[PDB]
Design a protein around this motif. Structure first.
Motif, PDB file in Angstrom:
ATOM      1  N   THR A   1       0.821  -1.196   0.000  1.00  0.00           N
ATOM      2  CA  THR A   1       0.000   0.000   0.000  1.00  0.00           C
ATOM      3  C   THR A   1       0.865   1.259   0.000  1.00  0.00           C
ATOM      4  OG1 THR A   1      -0.252  -0.275   2.419  1.00  0.00           O
ATOM      5  CG2 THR A   1      -2.092  -0.969   1.016  1.00  0.00           C
TER       6      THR A   1
ATOM      7  N   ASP B   1       0.138   4.131  21.113  1.00  0.00           N
ATOM      8  CA  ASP B   1       1.550   4.260  21.463  1.00  0.00           C
ATOM      9  C   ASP B   1       2.435   3.504  20.475  1.00  0.00           C
ATOM     10  OD1 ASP B   1       3.600   5.055  23.667  1.00  0.00           O
ATOM     11  OD2 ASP B   1       3.960   2.910  23.409  1.00  0.00           O
ATOM     12  N   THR B   2       1.842   2.548  19.774  1.00  0.00           N
ATOM     13  CA  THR B   2       2.577   1.738  18.809  1.00  0.00           C
ATOM     14  C   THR B   2       3.141   2.598  17.675  1.00  0.00           C
ATOM     15  OG1 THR B   2       0.977  -0.037  19.274  1.00  0.00           O
ATOM     16  CG2 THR B   2       2.486  -0.377  17.422  1.00  0.00           C
ATOM     17  N   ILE B   3       2.435   3.666  17.324  1.00  0.00           N
ATOM     18  CA  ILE B   3       2.883   4.541  16.249  1.00  0.00           C
ATOM     19  C   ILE B   3       3.234   5.935  16.773  1.00  0.00           C
ATOM     20  CG2 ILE B   3       1.605   3.293  14.481  1.00  0.00           C
ATOM     21  CD1 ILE B   3      -0.545   5.442  14.621  1.00  0.00           C
ATOM     22  N   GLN B   4       3.124   6.113  18.093  1.00  0.00           N
ATOM     23  CA  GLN B   4       3.448   7.384  18.770  1.00  0.00           C
ATOM     24  C   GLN B   4       2.470   8.516  18.446  1.00  0.00           C
ATOM     25  OE1 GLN B   4       5.320   8.496  21.175  1.00  0.00           O
ATOM     26  NE2 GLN B   4       6.105   6.442  21.593  1.00  0.00           N
ATOM     27  N   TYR B   5       1.654   8.342  17.420  1.00  0.00           N
ATOM     28  CA  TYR B   5       0.698   9.371  17.031  1.00  0.00           C
ATOM     29  C   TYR B   5      -0.515   9.367  17.959  1.00  0.00           C
ATOM     30  CZ  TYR B   5       3.458   9.867  12.774  1.00  0.00           C
ATOM     31  OH  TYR B   5       4.484  10.086  11.883  1.00  0.00           O
TER      32      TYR B   5
ATOM     33  N   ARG C   1      -6.226  -6.781  12.302  1.00  0.00           N
ATOM     34  CA  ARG C   1      -5.266  -7.814  12.655  1.00  0.00           C
ATOM     35  C   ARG C   1      -4.518  -7.422  13.925  1.00  0.00           C
ATOM     36  NH1 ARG C   1      -4.467 -11.143   8.050  1.00  0.00           N
ATOM     37  NH2 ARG C   1      -3.214 -12.384   9.525  1.00  0.00           N
ATOM     38  N   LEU C   2      -4.103  -6.162  13.983  1.00  0.00           N
ATOM     39  CA  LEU C   2      -3.367  -5.634  15.129  1.00  0.00           C
ATOM     40  C   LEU C   2      -4.192  -5.735  16.409  1.00  0.00           C
ATOM     41  CD1 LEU C   2      -0.514  -4.226  15.320  1.00  0.00           C
ATOM     42  CD2 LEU C   2      -1.804  -2.115  15.686  1.00  0.00           C
TER      43      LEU C   2
ATOM     44  N   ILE D   1       5.191   5.146  11.381  1.00  0.00           N
ATOM     45  CA  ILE D   1       5.089   4.795  12.793  1.00  0.00           C
ATOM     46  C   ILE D   1       5.875   5.764  13.675  1.00  0.00           C
ATOM     47  CG2 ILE D   1       4.729   2.363  12.250  1.00  0.00           C
ATOM     48  CD1 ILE D   1       7.692   2.003  13.364  1.00  0.00           C
TER      49      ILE D   1
ATOM     50  N   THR E   1      -3.687  -9.384  17.797  1.00  0.00           N
ATOM     51  CA  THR E   1      -2.388  -9.718  18.358  1.00  0.00           C
ATOM     52  C   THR E   1      -2.033  -8.836  19.553  1.00  0.00           C
ATOM     53  OG1 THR E   1      -1.758  -8.741  16.230  1.00  0.00           O
ATOM     54  CG2 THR E   1      -0.909 -10.949  16.739  1.00  0.00           C
TER      55      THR E   1
ATOM     56  N   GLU F   1      -5.971   0.129   5.083  1.00  0.00           N
ATOM     57  CA  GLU F   1      -6.084  -0.056   3.647  1.00  0.00           C
ATOM     58  C   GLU F   1      -5.781  -1.502   3.294  1.00  0.00           C
ATOM     59  OE1 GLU F   1      -3.379  -0.011   5.277  1.00  0.00           O
ATOM     60  OE2 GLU F   1      -1.907   1.004   4.017  1.00  0.00           O
ATOM     61  N   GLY F   2      -4.730  -2.032   3.906  1.00  0.00           N
ATOM     62  CA  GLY F   2      -4.345  -3.402   3.660  1.00  0.00           C
ATOM     63  C   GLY F   2      -5.023  -4.367   4.609  1.00  0.00           C
ATOM     64  N   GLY F   3      -5.846  -3.832   5.506  1.00  0.00           N
ATOM     65  CA  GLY F   3      -6.563  -4.660   6.461  1.00  0.00           C
ATOM     66  C   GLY F   3      -5.694  -5.134   7.606  1.00  0.00           C
ATOM     67  N   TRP F   4      -4.808  -4.267   8.083  1.00  0.00           N
ATOM     68  CA  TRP F   4      -3.908  -4.630   9.173  1.00  0.00           C
ATOM     69  C   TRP F   4      -4.423  -4.176  10.544  1.00  0.00           C
ATOM     70  CZ3 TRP F   4      -1.170  -0.702  11.847  1.00  0.00           C
ATOM     71  CH2 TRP F   4      -1.247   0.573  11.276  1.00  0.00           C
TER      72      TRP F   4
END
Lengths: 52, 52
Positions: A35, B45-49, B31-32, A47, B35, B25-28
């Motif tokens: 993507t 916090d995973t992306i800090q944003y 999924r996240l 990220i 997990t 967009e990719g369908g993640w």
């Protein structure tokens, strides 16, 4: 697998990510690369984590 | 679809993401949340944003 029609530098964009410390559990990495392309400079910014 | 045995607040953990503007967009994302659990605070916090 990897045919001679595949660019050796293009596939190295995936291996480079793995060595950077990027790993996927569900396989979101390969999806993100489809993507947002194999643009490491863009994916790293996605990220925020660029240094630590 | 959604069985009455499922917590109505647990399913809203996904809806809340949409309300936050989070979309994949990719369908993640779907999924996240499996997990890393439906931990909104952890995901941000995973992306800090989390600020902007």
């Amino acid at each position: 697998g990897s045919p001679p029609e595949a660019d050796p530098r293009l596939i190295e964009s995936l291996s480079q990510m793995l060595s950077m410390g990027f790993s996927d559990e569900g396989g979101w990495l390969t999806r993100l690369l489809q993507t947002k392309n194999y643009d490491i400079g863009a994916a790293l910014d996605t990220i925020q984590y660029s240094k630590h």
